[PDB]
């Protein structure tokens, strides 16, 4: 039952909490992985949480110096949503320090990047069987979404990056059918930067909102159809979504240079001319999270919004966030339901521990009444291994 | 149902990493078995990792003196590939200190050898039910492959050894159908030595590359059809695959005597006159691993190869390695895919611990672009129990 994808995003007024794993609170005593960069991808029967382990358990001596992202010990695994990642309930997916995964309605597609920085190779698995590989074409750090890829009509689409992290890079869109890369184009986007895109299907096309790590405190987007015929731009809204970012003011449809030369992975949902912006509460550090509804924030640069919903408090740590959807063959509805997840990073670079890890929370958009609160990580640091 | 039977091996160019369990890094805190001699065997639906536990968990007082291979506490278990072997996710297979296992497309066949050295008995289980037993015929240490047996057309084939470990022994090929030994021949191979064969099917025949533990630093092979009509010889490449071995020079197709009176279990894939040789990087100790492609290394004794791919650094420990295949009913392709696994031994005989164990990595051959790196064990020794 390959997904139809002709459906459009559902009309929503707020977000209702879907899951919370309490990984670090449980991992104090239990045997829980040191993960980072979780993401949620849904099949036609269930939803799973994919994470990149560090190869070590939490509160263990092998979690020493797990702030580093690229090591030969990182693997991509998956557990059912809302459960703490442990070696006793997790399914092994791929060996990777950068990954993405999605379900076409028949089998899981897994992309996992591993290897040296100047020669990294992405290994594409379909139903657990290696089907194709993609090698780095700019012999720089090859990297992928860290969130789910998007299938429409049996074809999953993904975006990969290869090149400098502070300058112009190379951006490619891949069309994958049953593990084979059947088509790929290299985006002609001068003066743009795309990293860690979060893609969702909408009306038969794909929409990706990425992270500008070079010179943009707003977020770039790329939209394409099944022919990989693309459009590029930035989210005009004066309510900037990146981090670090300046204070809210008059925004831009081209890169915003001020205080913009880094970022964090994020997302946004386009509703005509409006946009649902998910961003941290603090403009300098990854603390807090809120959802903003700017009714004209996709094309107008006003700085004026309509609705806020609070997710985490500016006094609590947050981290990466991304978007996933629940297809009509899963929910039974007639629209594609937008959902999102947030990663709550605890540990180094800002706490006095030897490790860094992150738990996750996830929300799904509903048309009924909802409430804003704070669902923080809740872990009490430092642990025993830090003493 | 039945598996393979005509499918030759797939055209390949390199090896892409398939799995990595991080057993010893996880076993520092988690409850992970003290295993050794893992191997991977694939069914028509999944692939599993089979291992021989020592009957004790890692970083425990019962792991004291687990350098020994034969004890009444060793058992054969299996876990899904890429997962750490723990008592909470492992399936019990047989009681054995020597074992092999393979899947005929209907049910798992398990062979497990246990008992005294002069009376060991192999217990053949099919679908978990004891179906037949084979008793030692030379009243010396009876031993088997330590890797998967090979089914072609519903019949699995295995090779067993019984006799001296530094001299002429007795070698038998067994043909097993649904747990019954239907045919067996004893190989007439004077001045040869076969131990710990790694067998794979190719074009309806079986090909085994074994370990010469008596007077050979290259590897012997035996090929036979479903009638158990066999051929014997040595790989005449000058790129020796055993360990310890001399430096590369003019090779030969008769046992190579120099520096050859021990070994390590290994493998090789025959491609016409070429060969894919998997060997450790150091000629004296089990450190490193590489894959060599000698385009004429099955019949010509030169020492010149074509391609190297690096698997583990020469500064990192390695161990046994073996070959498995993924049948076309699993991958969906039209040819048999060659894969291999490597065991990374950490502990005594070479580190100052009380235990020895090993994790595993595994690679599968692809026709696309790949990269060479080092995927080591990564465990920090000694552990707490050693202090």
């Amino acid at each position, epitope marked *: 039952v390959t997904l139809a994808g002709n459906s459009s995003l559902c009309p929503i007024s707020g977000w209702a909490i879907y899951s919370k794993d309490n990984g670090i609170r449980i991992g104090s005593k239990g045997d829980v992985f040191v993960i980072r960069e979780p993401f949620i991808s849904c099949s036609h029967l269930e939803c799973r949480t994919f994470f990149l382990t560090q190869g070590a358990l939490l509160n263990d001596k092998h979690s020493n110096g797990t702030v580093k992202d690229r090591s030969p010990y990182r693997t991509l695994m998956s557990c059912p949503v809302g459960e703490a990642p442990s070696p006793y309930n997790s399914r092994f997916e791929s060996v990777a320090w950068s990954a993405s995964a999605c379900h076409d309605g028949i089998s899981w597609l897994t992309i996992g990047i591993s290897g*040296p920085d100047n020669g990294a190779v992405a290994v594409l698995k379909y139903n657990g069987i290696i089907t194709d590989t993609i090698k780095s074409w700019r012999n720089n750090i090859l990297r992928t979404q860290e969130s789910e890829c998007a299938c429409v009509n049996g074809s999953c689409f993904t975006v990969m990056t290869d090149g400098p992290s502070n300058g112009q890079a190379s951006y490619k869109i891949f069309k994958i059918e049953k593990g084979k890369v059947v088509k790929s184009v290299e985006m002609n986007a001068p003066n743009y930067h795309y990293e860690e895109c979060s893609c969702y299907p909408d009306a038969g096309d794909i929409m990706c909102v990425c992270r500008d790590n070079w010179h943009g405190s707003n977020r770039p987007w790329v939209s394409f159809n099944q022919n990989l015929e693309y459009q590029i731009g930035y989210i005009c809204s004066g309510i900037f979504g990146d981090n670090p970012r300046p204070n809210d003011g008059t925004g831009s449809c081209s890169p915003m240079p001020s205080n913009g030369a880094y970022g964090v992975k994020g997302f946004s949902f386009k509703y005509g001319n409006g946009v649902w912006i998910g961003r941290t509460k603090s403009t300098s550090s990854r603390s807090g999270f809120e959802m903003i509804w700017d009714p004209n924030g996709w094309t107008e640069t006003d700085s004026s919004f309509s609705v806020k919903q609070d997710i985490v408090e500016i006094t609590d740590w947050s981290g990466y966030s991304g978007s996933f959807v629940q297809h009509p063959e899963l929910t039974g509805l007639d629209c594609m339901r937008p959902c999102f997840w947030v990663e709550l990073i605890r540990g180094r670079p800002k706490e006095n521990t030897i490790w860094t890890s992150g738990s996750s929370i996830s929300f799904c958009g509903v048309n009924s009444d909802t409430v804003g609160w704070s669902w923080p990580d809740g872990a009490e640091l430092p642990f025993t291994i830090d003493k | 149902v039945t598996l393979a039977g005509n499918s030759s091996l797939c055209p390949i160019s390199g090896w892409a990493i398939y799995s990595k369990d991080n057993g010893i890094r996880i076993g520092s805190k988690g409850d992970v078995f003290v295993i050794r001699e893992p191997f991977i065997s694939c069914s028509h639906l999944e692939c599993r990792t089979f291992f021989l536990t020592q009957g004790a968990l890692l970083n425990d007082k019962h792991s004291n003196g687990t350098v020994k291979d034969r004890s009444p506490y060793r058992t054969l278990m299996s876990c899904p590939v890429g997962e750490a072997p723990s008592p909470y996710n492992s399936r019990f297979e047989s009681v054995a200190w020597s074992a092999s296992a393979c899947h005929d497309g209907i049910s798992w066949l398990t062979i497990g050898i246990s008992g005294p050295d002069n009376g060991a008995v192999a217990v053949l289980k099919y679908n978990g039910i004891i179906t037949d037993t084979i008793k030692s015929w030379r009243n010396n240490i009876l031993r088997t492959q330590e890797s998967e047996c090979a089914c072609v057309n519903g019949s699995c084939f295995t090779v067993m050894t019984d006799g001296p470990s530094n001299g002429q022994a007795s070698y038998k090929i067994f043909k097993i159908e649904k747990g019954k030994v239907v045919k067996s021949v004893e190989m007439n191979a004077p001045n040869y030595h076969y131990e710990e064969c790694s067998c794979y099917p190719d074009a309806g025949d079986i090909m085994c590359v074994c370990r010469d533990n008596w007077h050979g630093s290259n590897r012997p092979w035996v090929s036979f059809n479903q009638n158990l009509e066999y051929q014997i010889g040595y790989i005449c490449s000058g790129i020796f695959g055993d360990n310890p071995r001399p430096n590369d020079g003019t090779g030969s197709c008769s046992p190579m005597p120099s520096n050859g009176a021990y070994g390590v279990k290994g493998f090789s894939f025959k491609y016409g006159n070429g060969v894919w040789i998997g060997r450790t990087k150091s000629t004296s100790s089990r450190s490193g691993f590489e894959m060599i492609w000698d385009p004429n290394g099955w019949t010509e004794t030169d020492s010149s190869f074509s391609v190297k791919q690096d698997i583990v650094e020469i500064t990192d420990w390695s161990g046994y390695s073996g070959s498995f295949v993924q049948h076309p009913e699993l991958t969906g392709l039209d040819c048999m895919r060659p894969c291999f696994w490597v065991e990374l031994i950490r502990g005594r005989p070479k580190e100052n611990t009380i235990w020895t164990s090993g994790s595993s990595i595994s690679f599968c051959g692809v026709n696309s672009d790949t990269v060479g790196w080092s995927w080591p064990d990564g465990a920090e020794l000694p552990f707490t129990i050693d202090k």
Partner: nanobody, 123 residues
Framework: EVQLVESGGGLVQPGGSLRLSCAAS????????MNWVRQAPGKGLEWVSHISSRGLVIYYADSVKGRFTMSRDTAKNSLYLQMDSLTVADTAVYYC????????????????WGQGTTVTVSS
């Protein structure tokens, strides 16, 4: 476990040539960035050169640019520094240092060092 050891130091006359070698153990160069840092007798630390994990030499000091050459051998895990046309101001003690570029957080800071080798120039 992780270790860096420099070699190649010695008494050399002015205008000569030399080449140091830093052997690293416990980690691979295909992931971490490396650095040459020198301390003159009576002065502070100075950053000589900086090479990536991709093999690109990002930085040379202003004084040594055009004279020194930094390279590496990843199959051997070795870092090298060829000095040519040495002057009297090149008398110093040299360290090979190691830091990391994180894809998310960025650069890290020189975490691991050696004892270093003394290069002195006489007459």
């Amino acid at each position: 476990e992780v270790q860096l050891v420099e070699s190649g130091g010695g008494l050399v006359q002015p205008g000569g040539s030399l080449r140091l070698s830093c052997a690293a153990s416990g980690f691979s160069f295909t992931t971490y960035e490396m650095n040459w840092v020198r301390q003159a007798p009576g002065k502070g630390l100075e950053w000589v050169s900086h090479i990536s994990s991709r093999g690109l030499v990002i930085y040379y000091a202003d004084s040594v640019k055009g004279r020194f050459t930094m390279s590496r051998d990843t199959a051997k895990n070795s870092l090298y520094l060829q000095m040519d046309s040495l002057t009297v101001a090149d008398t110093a003690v040299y360290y090979c240092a190691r830091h990391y570029f994180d894809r998310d957080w960025g650069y890290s800071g020189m975490d691991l060092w050696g004892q270093g080798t003394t290069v002195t120039v006489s007459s």
